[PDB]
RNA sequence: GGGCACCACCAGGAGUGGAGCCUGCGGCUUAAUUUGACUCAACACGGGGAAACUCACCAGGUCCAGACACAAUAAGGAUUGACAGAUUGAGAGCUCUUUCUUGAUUUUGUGGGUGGUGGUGCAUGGCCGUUCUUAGUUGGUGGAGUGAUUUGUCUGCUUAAUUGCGAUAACGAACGAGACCUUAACCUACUAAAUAGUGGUGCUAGCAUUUGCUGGUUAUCCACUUCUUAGAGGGACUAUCGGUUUCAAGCCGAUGGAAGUUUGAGGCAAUAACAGGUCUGUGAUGCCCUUAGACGUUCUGGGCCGCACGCGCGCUACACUGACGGAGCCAGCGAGUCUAACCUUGGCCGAGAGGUCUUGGUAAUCUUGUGAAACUCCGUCGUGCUGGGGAUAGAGCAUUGUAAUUAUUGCUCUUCAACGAGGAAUUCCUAGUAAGCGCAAGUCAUCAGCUUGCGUUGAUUACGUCCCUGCCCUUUGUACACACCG
């Protein structure tokens, strides 16, 4: 029972004449439909990351007073040290 | 890292007497520029030097800039039995 | 897989000093390492001059 | 050693690579640049190529 | 060298780009701000603008002979054909690359984002600038990323005056 | 050597027209105060090296293209000039960003 | 309710949807047919034109390129290879027999690294797309409100524009628009040029004549810059004059002008966002997975091209406003090799594709006046699926390549298919524009039916409106705020 490339010419069901008799499956005219972006505003992860996770990771809104009142002085110290190391001493 | 002692000494001698190495990241280049070993051998030996200290490494557009350090300039004298504390190699040797 | 070695002293070349006597034999090849190599069926195969090789065992 | 880079890559996509990142696809080799089109947009002001029109 | 002037000027631009990124990677702690390559006859001069020029020049020829040797070996120049000077940048708080590289090690040393960002925004602003803006984008122990801005003063965003006066 | 005119040509190439014209005016000023005979600064057509890359790193988006471009401005000056004092003034006075090349022509 | 826009319509143009191929997507098939992307904002997109490589996929085969540290170990011993002979792809010592060989470089465990086009782009950076090429955003002081807020930032008119006039509890400002920059258009005004051109002629020289058409030399000529080039400038500001508007911003016409559509075209382009795309651009990257019978890397061969079919971008067509042939004969943007064989003129050979001997060119120098195609003229055809169309298929000759079979592509002869202008629907477009036409560049060893640009020929139709679609603003309602996918 020889098969292979020589068995390809012997093998039935392969060929345009007998593929054209069989009907097209109906999935060929369908669509993938948007990779589940129909409710992308609705978060589907199931985390819904809480108030603490954003008020302690990037901080809350009320801690800006502690940040910039100390960020006033470090740049002034940088100016003082830059005048110290520029050409003085 | 099977690499002969004769080949290893020609990376270490060049690194001592000339200070730095540049090697393109192209393994099987079969010849490093101005080291007469394989480019894979150069990269492979200087990474082995880097891991125990002794060499700093930057990459920067596929070229592996290898620079000898202060612990490495002592290591290249001690284990390799090159003349002791008389040869800086090479940053202040001739040019200053 | 790669290589298994055997405990050895004498490589097919008996003894250079056997109670004051050289007891060497076994017609060699042109290797300066001479050294005595594989023979399957009337066919030696060289070890340093295995690239070009004229007369065998 | 035996067959490690035994295939000829004297030509084609795999002969050349970006000098920044070694990427065979999307490369520009106009004027001997050999930078990919994604790194050329980053470095294009350092090369000297400016958006004018 | 027998190449066309198109390819020669393009390749000199590529050499500038490669040298600039190499010094950006190498001289990060040393306050790098830019490089200028002067191609004189018989030698080329590579001038490094960096705030810590004493850290660039190292300890008595260390760290500047290293960079000269590294550049001449990668670009295959003859020894002595390339010399590599370092002159410090004046008015540090107007170099955007120096301010960004300063913020980078400020945040890598573990300093707060608003503190570092306002500490360079007002440093630029009283270094004598018309305006400054720091945008920080990313995440911090959080599964969601946000970008926050820190602006002070007068800025522009469109036109050739951006190529003129804005340093990014 | 004894003030024999040798017919050099200076080729001036740059991507920066301001500094290139600074060099060109310097050479013409030197050759006019030295009373040299010259064919002056001839300005070649500017080579506009255009690269139309794709603006996106992806495929996604409206298909937007960027025309990055580099201009090469090129000039040449012919100088029938003595050999020593003119090779001195072309050895000195080199601007960065402008590449010079000096070729002696006896054709 | 009012605005705006040929990603809307009107009036039209050119179409597409129908055919055949090309290409991309889905599905099916497969060992694999790698994968991301799905209304605009996926579908000639990932610069994605994949023979190998790329390559991520499949059947197999190597290699370690497993740092470093510790303990064993290798001094008990760790790499290499000549056969031939196989289950071999195989001249792969990959094993296995046989043996020798350079011998603390390794090897084997534990830790820990390193690699990954492996995952998560719903952890991120960066970049890009979109809202939006729209005109929007914000605070100082004052007014209103206990307050969140609101006015300013607006009824009208105008503009391309939160552009301005004007109304006015607001006044005066900033970003965005605009100004800016690049390009195109004018400059017989300036500085010039054997890498551009012209005129005489130092000198020539030819054919026809009574000077027309040319050829050739720049310490083996002179002069000039009109044309060409590129520096610095000039120029336009809707100028002038009418009309009209509240004599306001403006708009319309005419004259002049190189230019009166923001002069044409772009580049840059705010605040706020999107769970938009990308971890498969990177030595951008957290974490996870894998890490030597690997998901690293390499090699061999295949696949990405597989086809009952559905859809999108295109090419070629249905011809006489044309095909064929001969002749005429004209661009512009480019690019190009000694850091090695790139652009190739000329001669010769060849029907052709191509070959071969040389040459110029690292380029305003030479390819190149890219002697391009459409087009024009004269002929053959003659309304016939024809001499339209050129699919499919056969045989042959070449080129590139290590390799062309699943035809790489080119050429010659032959085969000569649907297609007779395309239902429902749908795209783009307002003047050097639509459209026809080729050329250059990109990727490229070879391959353009693609794209980015360039020029050649060059219309019809409106200078408008909210009717459809989308967007913006105001008013209104709200039990929405994860915001109607509520
Ligand atoms: Mg503005
Ligand atoms: Mg603007
Ligand atoms: Mg219509
Ligand atoms: Mg058509
Ligand atoms: Mg069709
Ligand atoms: Mg497929
Ligand atoms: Mg995905
Ligand atoms: Mg892989
Ligand atoms: Mg990676
Ligand atoms: Mg108020
Ligand atoms: Mg308001
Ligand atoms: Mg208003
Ligand atoms: Mg009011
Ligand atoms: Mg002129
Ligand atoms: Mg998503
Ligand atoms: Mg890709
Ligand atoms: Mg393969
Ligand atoms: Mg494909
Ligand atoms: Mg014809
Ligand atoms: Mg022309
Ligand atoms: Mg192909
Ligand atoms: Mg092409
Ligand atoms: Mg394509």
UniProtKB/Swiss-Prot annotation, chain A:
Q: Which GO terms describe its cellular component?
A: cytoplasm; nucleus; perinuclear region of cytoplasm
Composition bias, Basic and acidic residues: 8-25, 37-52, 59-72
GO molecular-function term, one example from the UniProt record = RNA binding
Query: Is Ubl conjugation set as a keyword in this record?
Result: yes
Q: Which UniProt keywords apply?
A: Acetylation, Cytoplasm, DNA-binding, Isopeptide bond, Nucleus, Phosphoprotein, Translation regulation, Ubl conjugation
Q: Spell out the disulfide connections.
A: none
Q: Which GO terms describe its biological process?
A: negative regulation of apoptotic process; regulation of translational initiation in response to stress; ribosome hibernation; telomere maintenance; TOR signaling; translational elongation
Where does the protein end up? Cytoplasm; Nucleus; Cytoplasm, Perinuclear region
Q: How is it modified after translation?
A: Phosphorylation by TORC1 upon nutrient replenishment inhibits STM1 and causes its release from dormant ribosomes.
Residues of crosslink Glycyl lysine isopeptide (Lys-Gly) (interchain with G-Cter in ubiquitin)? 69
The Phosphoserine modification is found at 3, 21, 66
Family, per entry = Belongs to the SERBP1-HABP4 family.
Subunit structure of this entry?
Associates with mature 80S ribosomes. Binds to the head domain of the 40S ribosomal subunit and prevents mRNA binding by inserting its alpha-helix domain towards the mRNA entry tunnel at the decoding site, where it blocks the binding of tRNA and mRNA at the A- and P-sites. Interacts with EFT1; interaction sequesters EFT1 at the A-site of the ribosome, thereby blocking the interaction sites of the mRNA-tRNA complex, promoting ribosome stabilization and hibernation. Interacts with CDC13. Associates with the telomere-proximal Y' element.
Q: What else is known?
A: Present with 46842 molecules/cell in log phase SD medium.
Protein name per Swiss-Prot or TrEMBL: Suppressor protein STM1
Which residues of the intact protein are shown?
53 to 141 of 273
From Swiss-Prot, chain C:
Q: What are the Phosphoserine sites (modified residues) in this protein?
A: 30
* Residue spans, zinc finger C4-type: 29-49
Where does this polypeptide localize? Cytoplasm
- Tell me the residues linked by Glycyl lysine isopeptide (Lys-Gly) (interchain with G-Cter in ubiquitin): 15, 21
Subunit record text: Component of the small ribosomal subunit (SSU). Mature yeast ribosomes consist of a small (40S) and a large (60S) subunit. The 40S small subunit contains 1 molecule of ribosomal RNA (18S rRNA) and 33 different proteins (encoded by 57 genes). The large 60S subunit contains 3 rRNA molecules (25S, 5.8S and 5S rRNA) and 46 different proteins (encoded by 81 genes).
What this chain does, per the entry, is described as: Component of the ribosome, a large ribonucleoprotein complex responsible for the synthesis of proteins in the cell. The small ribosomal subunit (SSU) binds messenger RNAs (mRNAs) and translates the encoded message by selecting cognate aminoacyl-transfer RNA (tRNA) molecules. The large subunit (LSU) contains the ribosomal catalytic site termed the peptidyl transferase center (PTC), which catalyzes the formation of peptide bonds, thereby polymerizing the amino acids delivered by tRNAs into a polypeptide chain.
Which named protein is this?
A: Small ribosomal subunit protein eS31
Stretch of the intact protein here: 93 to 152 of 152
Swiss-Prot record, chain D:
Pfam families, alphabetically? Answer: Ribosomal_S14
Main location group: cytoplasm
Q: Where in the cell is it found?
A: Cytoplasm
- List the PROSITE patterns hit by this protein, alphabetically: RIBOSOMAL_S14
Cofactor binding note: Binds 1 zinc ion per subunit.
Care to name a GO molecular-function term for this sequence?
Answer: structural constituent of ribosome
Q: What does this protein do?
A: Component of the ribosome, a large ribonucleoprotein complex responsible for the synthesis of proteins in the cell. The small ribosomal subunit (SSU) binds messenger RNAs (mRNAs) and translates the encoded message by selecting cognate aminoacyl-transfer RNA (tRNA) molecules. The large subunit (LSU) contains the ribosomal catalytic site termed the peptidyl transferase center (PTC), which catalyzes the formation of peptide bonds, thereby polymerizing the amino acids delivered by tRNAs into a polypeptide chain.
Q: How does it assemble?
A: Component of the small ribosomal subunit (SSU). Mature yeast ribosomes consist of a small (40S) and a large (60S) subunit. The 40S small subunit contains 1 molecule of ribosomal RNA (18S rRNA) and 33 different proteins (encoded by 57 genes). The large 60S subunit contains 3 rRNA molecules (25S, 5.8S and 5S rRNA) and 46 different proteins (encoded by 81 genes).
Remarks, miscellaneous = Present with 6490 molecules/cell in log phase SD medium.
Question: What protein name applies here?
Answer: Small ribosomal subunit protein uS14A
- Source organism (scientific name): Saccharomyces cerevisiae (strain ATCC 204508 / S288c) (Baker's yeast)
This chain is encoded by the gene named RPS29A
UniProtKB/Swiss-Prot annotation, chain E:
Quote the record's miscellaneous comment.
Present with 146000 molecules/cell in log phase SD medium.
Naming one, the record's GO cellular component terms include: 90S preribosome
MF (Gene Ontology): DNA-(apurinic or apyrimidinic site) endonuclease activity; RNA binding; structural constituent of ribosome
What keywords does the record list, in alphabetical order?
Cytoplasm, Isopeptide bond, Methylation, Phosphoprotein, Ribonucleoprotein, Ribosomal protein, RNA-binding, Ubl conjugation
Assembly behavior = Component of the small ribosomal subunit (SSU). Mature yeast ribosomes consist of a small (40S) and a large (60S) subunit. The 40S small subunit contains 1 molecule of ribosomal RNA (18S rRNA) and 33 different proteins (encoded by 57 genes). The large 60S subunit contains 3 rRNA molecules (25S, 5.8S and 5S rRNA) and 46 different proteins (encoded by 81 genes).
Give the family, as the similarity comment puts it: Belongs to the universal ribosomal protein uS3 family.
Q: What job does the chain carry out?
A: Component of the ribosome, a large ribonucleoprotein complex responsible for the synthesis of proteins in the cell. The small ribosomal subunit (SSU) binds messenger RNAs (mRNAs) and translates the encoded message by selecting cognate aminoacyl-transfer RNA (tRNA) molecules. The large subunit (LSU) contains the ribosomal catalytic site termed the peptidyl transferase center (PTC), which catalyzes the formation of peptide bonds, thereby polymerizing the amino acids delivered by tRNAs into a polypeptide chain.
Quote the subcellular location field of this record. Cytoplasm
KH type-2 domain: from which residue to which, for each copy?
19-90
Q: Tell me the gene name.
A: RPS3
């Amino acid at each position: 029972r020889p098969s292979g490339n020589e068995g390809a010419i012997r093998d039935k069901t392969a060929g345009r004449r007998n593929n054209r008799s069989k009907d097209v499956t109906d999935s060929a005219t369908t669509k993938k439909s948007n990779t589940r972006r129909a409710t992308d505003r609705h978060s589907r992860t199931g985390k819904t990351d809480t108030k603490k996770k954003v008020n302690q990771g990037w901080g809350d809104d009320k801690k800006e007073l502690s940040a910039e009142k100390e960020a006033q002085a470090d740049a002034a110290a940088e100016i003082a040290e830059d005048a110290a190391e520029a050409e003085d001493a | 890292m099977l690499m002969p002692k004769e080949d290893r000494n020609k990376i270490h001698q060049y690194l001592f007497q000339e200070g730095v190495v540049v090697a393109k990241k192209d393994f099987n280049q079969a010849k490093h520029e101005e080291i007469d070993t394989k480019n894979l051998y150069v990269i492979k030996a200087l990474q082995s030097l880097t891991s125990k200290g002794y060499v700093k490494t930057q990459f920067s557009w596929q070229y592996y800039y290898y620079t000898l350090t202060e612990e490495g300039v002592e290591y290249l004298r001690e284990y390799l039995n090159l003349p002791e504390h008389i040869v800086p190699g090479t940053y202040i040797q001739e040019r200053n | 897989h790669k290589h298994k070695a055997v405990k050895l002293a004498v490589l097919s070349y008996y003894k250079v000093d056997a109670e004051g006597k050289v007891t060497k034999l076994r017609r060699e090849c042109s290797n300066p390492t001479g050294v005595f190599l594989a023979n399957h069926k009337d066919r030696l195969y060289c070890g340093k001059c295995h690239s070009v090789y004229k007369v065998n065992a | 050693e035996n067959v490690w880079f035994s295939h000829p890559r004297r030509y084609g996509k795999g002969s050349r690579q970006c000098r920044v990142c070694s990427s065979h696809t999307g490369l520009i080799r106009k004027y001997g640049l050999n930078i990919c089109r994604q790194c050329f947009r980053e470095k294009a002001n350092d090369i000297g190529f400016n958006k004018f029109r | 060298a027998l190449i066309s002037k198109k390819r020669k000027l393009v390749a000199d631009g590529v050499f500038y780009a490669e040298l600039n990124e190499f010094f950006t990677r190498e001289l990060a702690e040393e306050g790098y701000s830019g490089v200028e390559v002067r191609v004189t006859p018989t030698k080329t001069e590579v001038i490094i603008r960096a705030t810590r020029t004493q850290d660039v020049l190292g300890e008595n020829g260390r760290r500047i002979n290293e960079l000269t040797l590294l550049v001449q070996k990668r670009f295959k120049y003859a020894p002595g054909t390339i010399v590599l000077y370092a002159e410090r940048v004046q008015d540090r708080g107007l170099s955007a690359v120096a301010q960004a590289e300063s913020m980078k090690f400020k945040l890598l040393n573990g300093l707060a984002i608003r503190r570092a960002a306002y500490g360079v925004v007002r440093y630029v602003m009283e270094s004598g600038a018309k305006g400054c803006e720091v945008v920080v984008s990313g995440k911090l122990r959080a599964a969601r990323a946000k970008a926050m801005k820190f602006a002070d003063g007068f800025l522009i965003h469109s036109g050739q005056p951006v190529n003129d006066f804005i340093d990014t | 050597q004894q003030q024999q005119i040798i017919k050099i040509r200076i080729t001036l190439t740059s991507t920066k027209v301001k500094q290139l014209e600074n060099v060109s005016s310097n050479i013409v000023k030197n050759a006019e105060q030295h009373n040299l005979v010259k064919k002056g600064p001839v300005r070649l057509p500017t080579k506009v090296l255009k690269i139309s890359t794709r603006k996106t790193p992806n495929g996604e988006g409206s298909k937007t293209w960027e025309t990055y471009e580099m201009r090469i401005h090129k000039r040449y000056i012919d100088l029938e000039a003595p050999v020593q004092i003119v090779k001195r003034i072309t050895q000195i006075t080199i601007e960065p960003g402008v590449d010079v090349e000096v070729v002696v022509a006896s054709n």
